[PDB]
Enzyme design. Sequence first.
Site, PDB file in Angstrom:
ATOM      1  N   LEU A   1     -52.539 -28.881  58.078  1.00 42.23           N
ATOM      2  CA  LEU A   1     -53.934 -29.324  58.036  1.00 42.23           C
ATOM      3  C   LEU A   1     -54.160 -30.735  58.586  1.00 42.23           C
ATOM      4  CD1 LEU A   1     -55.368 -27.990  54.655  1.00 42.23           C
ATOM      5  CD2 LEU A   1     -56.127 -27.387  56.967  1.00 42.23           C
TER       6      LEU A   1
ATOM      7  N   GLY B   1     -53.940 -32.181  61.465  1.00 41.57           N
ATOM      8  CA  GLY B   1     -52.902 -32.756  62.305  1.00 41.57           C
ATOM      9  C   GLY B   1     -51.819 -33.557  61.590  1.00 41.57           C
TER      10      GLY B   1
ATOM     11  N   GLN C   1     -52.002 -35.493  58.764  1.00 39.00           N
ATOM     12  CA  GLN C   1     -52.373 -36.690  58.001  1.00 39.00           C
ATOM     13  C   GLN C   1     -52.179 -36.525  56.493  1.00 39.00           C
ATOM     14  OE1 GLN C   1     -56.747 -37.421  57.802  1.00 39.00           O
ATOM     15  NE2 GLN C   1     -56.992 -35.664  59.201  1.00 39.00           N
ATOM     16  N   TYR C   2     -52.188 -35.282  56.022  1.00 42.76           N
ATOM     17  CA  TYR C   2     -52.144 -35.038  54.584  1.00 42.76           C
ATOM     18  C   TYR C   2     -50.719 -34.879  54.016  1.00 42.76           C
ATOM     19  CZ  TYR C   2     -57.097 -34.025  55.637  1.00 42.76           C
ATOM     20  OH  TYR C   2     -58.397 -34.071  56.106  1.00 42.76           O
TER      21      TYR C   2
ATOM     22  N   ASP D   1     -55.480 -42.988  42.953  1.00 43.75           N
ATOM     23  CA  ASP D   1     -55.532 -42.978  44.410  1.00 43.75           C
ATOM     24  C   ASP D   1     -56.945 -42.846  44.960  1.00 43.75           C
ATOM     25  OD1 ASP D   1     -54.214 -43.500  46.723  1.00 43.75           O
ATOM     26  OD2 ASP D   1     -53.105 -41.614  46.816  1.00 43.75           O
TER      27      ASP D   1
ATOM     28  N   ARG E   1     -60.394 -41.483  52.020  1.00 44.19           N
ATOM     29  CA  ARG E   1     -59.398 -40.616  52.647  1.00 44.19           C
ATOM     30  C   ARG E   1     -58.935 -39.498  51.697  1.00 44.19           C
ATOM     31  NH1 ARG E   1     -56.930 -45.605  51.653  1.00 44.19           N
ATOM     32  NH2 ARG E   1     -55.520 -45.523  49.840  1.00 44.19           N
TER      33      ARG E   1
ATOM     34  N   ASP F   1     -56.244 -34.847  45.782  1.00 40.77           N
ATOM     35  CA  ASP F   1     -54.959 -35.558  45.729  1.00 40.77           C
ATOM     36  C   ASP F   1     -54.629 -36.119  44.351  1.00 40.77           C
ATOM     37  OD1 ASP F   1     -52.477 -36.387  46.540  1.00 40.77           O
ATOM     38  OD2 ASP F   1     -53.187 -38.234  47.529  1.00 40.77           O
TER      39      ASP F   1
HETATM   40  C1  LIG Z   1     -50.040 -34.075  49.671  1.00 42.16           C
HETATM   41  N1  LIG Z   1     -51.355 -34.549  50.051  1.00 42.16           N
HETATM   42  C2  LIG Z   1     -52.493 -34.172  49.275  1.00 42.16           C
HETATM   43  O1  LIG Z   1     -52.354 -33.459  48.301  1.00 42.16           O
HETATM   44  C3  LIG Z   1     -53.846 -34.659  49.660  1.00 42.16           C
HETATM   45  C4  LIG Z   1     -54.074 -36.023  49.792  1.00 42.16           C
HETATM   46  C5  LIG Z   1     -55.330 -36.488  50.150  1.00 42.16           C
HETATM   47  C6  LIG Z   1     -56.370 -35.586  50.377  1.00 42.16           C
HETATM   48  C7  LIG Z   1     -56.141 -34.216  50.242  1.00 42.16           C
HETATM   49  C8  LIG Z   1     -54.890 -33.750  49.886  1.00 42.16           C
HETATM   50  S1  LIG Z   1     -54.616 -31.991  49.723  1.00 42.16           S
HETATM   51  C9  LIG Z   1     -55.816 -31.161  50.764  1.00 42.16           C
HETATM   52  C10 LIG Z   1     -55.878 -31.474  52.130  1.00 42.16           C
HETATM   53  C11 LIG Z   1     -56.821 -30.834  52.958  1.00 42.16           C
HETATM   54  C12 LIG Z   1     -57.709 -29.870  52.407  1.00 42.16           C
HETATM   55  C13 LIG Z   1     -58.751 -29.070  52.982  1.00 42.16           C
HETATM   56  C14 LIG Z   1     -59.182 -29.064  54.423  1.00 42.16           C
HETATM   57  C15 LIG Z   1     -58.808 -30.076  55.265  1.00 42.16           C
HETATM   58  C16 LIG Z   1     -59.441 -30.170  56.626  1.00 42.16           C
HETATM   59  C17 LIG Z   1     -60.447 -29.283  56.970  1.00 42.16           C
HETATM   60  C18 LIG Z   1     -61.020 -29.383  58.229  1.00 42.16           C
HETATM   61  C19 LIG Z   1     -60.571 -30.363  59.101  1.00 42.16           C
HETATM   62  C20 LIG Z   1     -59.561 -31.227  58.715  1.00 42.16           C
HETATM   63  N2  LIG Z   1     -59.024 -31.108  57.488  1.00 42.16           N
HETATM   64  N3  LIG Z   1     -59.279 -28.324  51.993  1.00 42.16           N
HETATM   65  N4  LIG Z   1     -58.621 -28.610  50.819  1.00 42.16           N
HETATM   66  C21 LIG Z   1     -57.649 -29.565  51.070  1.00 42.16           C
HETATM   67  C22 LIG Z   1     -56.688 -30.221  50.223  1.00 42.16           C
HETATM   68 NA    NA Z   2     -56.298 -47.118  42.160  1.00 43.39          NA
END
Ligand SMILES: CNC(=O)c1ccccc1Sc1ccc2c(/C=C/c3ccccn3)n[nH]c2c1
Ligand code: NA
Length: 266
Positions: free
Chosen positions: A16, A18, A20-21, A126, A130, A144
């Site tokens: 997801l 690219g 970043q997550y 956190d 972002r 997160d």
């Molecule tokens: C390990 N990292 C995380 O758990 C985390 C940290 C920060 C923010 C989120 C997450 S987990 C997460 C990431 C992406 C998502 C999405 C969709 C992401 C997205 C959708 C469209 C374009 C770009 N990105 N839906 N639910 C999500 C949950």
């Molecule tokens: Na904090």
Amino acid sequence: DKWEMERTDITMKHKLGGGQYGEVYEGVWKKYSLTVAVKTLEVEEFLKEAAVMKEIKHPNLVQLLGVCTREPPFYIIIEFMTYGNLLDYLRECNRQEVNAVVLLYMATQISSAMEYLEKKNFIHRDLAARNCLVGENHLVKVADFGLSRLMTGDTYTAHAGAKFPIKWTAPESLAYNKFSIKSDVWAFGVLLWEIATYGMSPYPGIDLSQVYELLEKDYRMERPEGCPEKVYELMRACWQWNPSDRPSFAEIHQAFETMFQESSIS
Ligand SMILES: CNC(=O)c1ccccc1Sc1ccc2c(/C=C/c3ccccn3)n[nH]c2c1
Ligand code: NA
Ligand code: NA
Ligand code: NI
Ligand code: NI
């Protein structure tokens, strides 16, 4: 465990946003024809992150769909938020669409979620743009929960040598590694500023190493252009040096619910 499900229920797509997550994948839950987000994989942290997500439920907290915890790779199935993260969303939007009313609406939702956590005696640790995710019609959810914790006292102590996002972290947390709901309130203040600026980086041009010294001296970011005064006032209350002088999330939320409704009347 009612949350446990068969991995083969999910067809795994690409990573997801690219990458970043971290390791989090778009996935399809075939039975339900549903696009989902899948967090895969020390696993100790990973598994507790799942137990936490099973405890909390709220329309502005990203919802757990399921998990496969029984064998590796471990999955954490989370709802898919179509518009991705708030930071990028703010940067890329049409401001005529996502306008002053929308900004108020976002703060109201986030503070609603934090008020719920506060009442439950959790801490997030956190909070930031972002880490918020955006759905249709400016739906916003906090995500997160990896650092999220149920408190036994009023304070939580991070492990020695843990490192933090300096520009979002409360002074007592930076100095003593002490976290509380008050520290979250501080970070929420920084989040409001991220919102008011449509995703500018905080303390612009100020090097990380000088930030704590500045805060000690009662330097605080200036009122962003176009930011209503009531909202700046809330930011400043969030950034009080003494945690006990920071407002509660219950108070913050009430203040936003009020502003949002009055703005809707216009
Ligand atoms: C390990 N990292 C995380 O758990 C985390 C940290 C920060 C923010 C989120 C997450 S987990 C997460 C990431 C992406 C998502 C999405 C969709 C992401 C997205 C959708 C469209 C374009 C770009 N990105 N839906 N639910 C999500 C949950
Ligand atoms: Na904090
Ligand atoms: Na920690
Ligand atoms: Ni409410
Ligand atoms: Ni409320």
